[PDB]
């Protein structure tokens, strides 16, 4: 009950941390992408980081609204995330693949947050993450199509 | 009484709550005073604009499911679980009245989802899920103001 | 003098109450109108209630600006208005007729407020209600034309 | 479970493309004194139908399916038709009511299938749809009232 | 060939100004349960008539002619009238159908004169006008159907 | 009292339609190095005139009157004319000054009639008008200065 | 002295008041401090934008009626019934200065209507009627802030 | 002459609806490193195809004809197909080049029939369509070059 | 027939680029009390010239031709020049009247060649250009009148 | 050093005062311009006063940001400016010439402020006035061209 | 070490400072409380929007001059001269933290101009000149709030 | 000092007009699968080039100079050319890199000249330019990477 609530809050802090580190990674890809798909991917990556920033603010405000305490420092993001903004990507295909890998991991982990939220009778927290899955699975299809 | 009628009746109570809230927010918009006047006068208008949208959305959902929305001030008064009455005078008193009404609206909206779900009405539950998200955000903001 | 002022304030509270109850009635008509003029009248009624809401805020703020105390609860609106949001309208023509009846009553009563305001040397309060008469008499002509 | 979901999306995709078609027929052939209102309303509805076509196809693709994508396949996979012999404004509006009512029952069945397959995002898409279609069923039924 | 074209433009400029006038009369006097639709439609149509007036006059100027520009001249040069005793909604709409059809056939003669004078640009102006009026004729005729 | 008000609105309605006409003549025929400025200013003024035409007619209707609505009636009920033989930019601008000056005196007389008939809303419409016309009289007189 | 000249002269005083008010509002915009800084810094800009519009409207009406608007800072100083000077330091002092000047402007604008009406100039009276409405609204808002 | 024009418009209306369909198939199935560019381009092109469908149908109506308006009729009256086995990006783009070129030459025949019936306005519609499709042909051919 | 059309488009593309250049010279050097009006007008006109350059070139591409695309080629293929010794406002405006009139008559020859090659779409491009330039000729000539 | 700072602050107060008096002058020209260039110059003068108002606010806020105290009364503007809003202009050419004269004086004086700002190692204050010179020298060229 | 490398390295420190500032401003946006909640919650978002624009501008300038921007949170932490850490709780504490970081950023940006100028890189200096203008404005506004 | 500044602006003005020209050649002739991206990017760049042309000319005028204003003078005063025989997308992009790199070195030299003549505003204009060109050099070099 109190444990159910704490499990939900902790899971939101992990996802908040993932989305902040993804916003960071997307800057790295925006800045270092090269080759003849430069214009397309430089722009796409900025669109994606704008969406990541929105998501950061949406998760943190939902956590606050349920009585929790969002993590809010880069050291905390690094300690609580299940992903990293690091990596050794150089080519356009490696960058696009890296994003497919992070968005697939976020989709699976968001499904686990829905289960926790539902177990705590928190339909609004569940609904937030259902909407996220929709958006990230769309981008996995587009990014996977780029690579096909 | 019926699974259907229980859903319709619960939508009429919430329709009534949101209209009475629109009313109370006008009273606060008009009588708020002190050095947070500008901020709160404006915030209360933004909130009543949201309340008016919510009134139309709930009534239109009720119609879509075959019900009959209440649609006079006498009926809103008789069907609501909150009131537009009160003797709030200070900015803090007004903000705290809103926290109380939004908290009530959130708990009852969670009960609506349960009724709707039991009547296999996922679309009605979803409207209330969305309202819970917006109201609990406002509860956080207004409680922060008082903190 | 003080009586002149109190008569003006009381008259504004009656009109504020009328316009709030009209905003309510217009919702009822928006929701329950039927027949082949549904799209036209559903939309028209929303336009009209948007205007009623504006008018509510304009009268209440003028009352405040002259040192008065607007009524601000539905119980007060019901006790101070000269009209009602109630009624037994079912057809599109009955709904449109009901509005012609309320807008004509508001126009006559607003002319009486101009006389009171002028007697108290309150030109700005008079000007508010002159502008209202213009708008409501336009709508009476359009709504009466629908019914002709 | 997964194949049943995919197949159900292709039926609904097909229904929405055939409704887009039927709405053009009514937009073009409506007549009588409610011409202006209904010619415009039918265009609004087909714009919504087109958006719904793209959203369902793109969800199907994101879950690893293959959207049907020819008029022959739509005809074959749909549970409605774009045919009929409606002539008056009321016949046209009543035909829309019937199709939207059918789509809404079928969409509730899709939600159950998706939920049983633990696919909450696919289910959410059909929930939203039901909201919009049942609004239109109320509005169109009210016109006939 | 050139003075024929110029005189033919003056007659059409006159027609469009008189139509602008008639469309105000219908906007103001239309009644009955299609009031909102027709009051608004008649405004949209007069806005189009005023744009057309300015485009004809300015093409006449551009070819070296002298557009008529007083109501006495418009009455004197037009082939339609702004007069009439229309009262019902149907009478007003039927009156517009009549005028627009006369405007189309006469604009086809302007095209032929223009083409005979190797004035493609004037012809093109009127081709576009015919496209617009015949659409309005279909719409208004559909209202009456 | 009421009939005198109605008749006075029909005169002013007529004046404004004939000014709309005269402004098109000046828009089309202005020449010399102030062409661009004045061709554009005359269009702005006729857009305002058209709006004033619709506002006066709709007020007349709201008070239970019957707006005149043909160019023959405008000619007959107006206190100005759309005729004249202005040729230079200054002649055109001076003719506008004269008409706007006349309209403004006549509008003050309308306000007295309306006030005597206890019609404050009709009176308000002409007050607003006077504000706008006297602005234009200052601007046009300054051009001539 | 004349019915006409009395109207023209009263418009020059009000033109001058509104320009000096535009000036004072800049001083407040620039020097306001304390925790209502953001709200008041912004409000004072909105108010000076309105004052600038009002200056142009009054001058253009004066021109339209055949008068000559004053149009230098020396003349504004000499014709105004208010000043842009003052030693206001606190937010409350600045807001109260504005309430005082707006109240004065409203009472004198009512006197203008009377002069204009006596010269059968309804259009000039109407401009001032509209100004009274806007200023008295602001007086309510600013007084509420101090309440 | 008139029934030939009408039948020729039905065939083109059919072609544009089938192209709208094919463009959805390519939007959904395109893959490889030009995905973002082509997915978006194919949407822009289908938006244009839908506008074209409505403009043809409404011109057919305006001349007194009866537009086809079911997918069975479009299949029955069209000269292209929405079928095909395109998989690669190049195959899809080449397929669009083929269809647009067929649409251009056939639209040139519509122009000649229209002109023979003194229907300049219908001809003009198709002249504008040829301008747009041949630009797209150049662009798409350039992609393949 | 086809190589004649292509060469004729190159000459017009060249003319529009050189006009763009000349219009910059006039924008920069115009003086006297019509400065604000003419400085701005000359910018509006060069914006139109740049749009025209791109539309001609892209039509040439669309028909299978090779647009010229260096200033040495524009000088070599044009029938006007961007040179000249215009100093006064009147000289600059008169120079534009001269160029626009030459552009119109030459565009009428392009229309005839295009029509002889059954290229309606190219012809239509130039018909629209003539409409625009002759309006500008009237406006600029009016300035000088 | 402290003297360097005080010289910069005083120079900004003189320019703030110039720009306020120019805003005033531009109203006078907007209201009293006459002749056949009326429409053009009435509009141009309003555009210019809108720019002067912006400049007023920009200089005053820069002065505040460097620790100074902007003058903020018309009496102070009159005492600190190097220009006046007064004058005996009647014709359109005299008005346009008067503005050329003030904008040329402002450009020269702004160059002197750049020298003072640079001597105090204040690059941002210098940059503000470089941007002003660009704009005012553009208008001197246009206004001088009107008169050529 | 080189005139070029000194410029590149100084841009990486400032890039890092602006990203960590974007972070701190989120923490303040989320935890600010008390009666200035609405004003400050909104102000802090406007400031982080500006910080994000600044991050992209500095990184893109560094790239244009042939450098390599740092682009992970570990590197931002190691290269910055400020931190996103802190225990600020009150509105005044948060506003004062911002004044401190903006003042630091302004002084170091002046040092960058000097390095850039010594490497004949006027375009890099100009980017920093513009940042100084915006930051010192904010320092005035935030200090006024505390006054 | 002053004459050296003026002469240097005329060289840079010329460079920017010739780059505007070269960007149209590449916009029109680019081919291969990066067609859509590069056809659009080249148009964005020529819009920027046109704005840069007007800004440099207007600065030159404000300092009392005389901008060159014919294609013959641009050819003669420029340090680059709009000629060349680029054919592939990479050749086109590499040619842009070379021109932007050259413009940027030359603009730094202009800044020194302007500073030595105590002209900080002219110097500022070239600083801003360097910022924008070096951005494009990074983006274009990255495409080639």
Swiss-Prot record, chains A, C, J:
Entries under InterPro entries matching the protein: DPS_DNA-bd, DPS_DNA-bd_CS, Ferritin-like, Ferritin-like_SF, Ferritin_DPS_dom
SUPFAM superfamilies (UniProt xref): Ferritin-like
Induction, per UniProt: By oxidative stress and by growth in minimal medium lacking iron (Fe(3+)), or one of the divalent cations manganese, copper or cobalt.
CDD domains: DPS
Keyword list, A-Z: DNA-binding, Stress response
Pfam families (alphabetical): Ferritin
Molecular function GO terms recorded: DNA binding; ferric iron binding; oxidoreductase activity, acting on metal ions
Gene3D superfamilies, per the entry: 1.20.1260.10
UniProt function note: Forms highly stable, multimeric protein-DNA complexes which accumulate in stationary-phase cells and protect against oxidative killing.
Family: Belongs to the Dps family.
Protein name: Metalloregulation DNA-binding stress protein
Lineage, highest ranks first: Bacteria, Bacillati, Bacillota, Bacilli, Bacillales
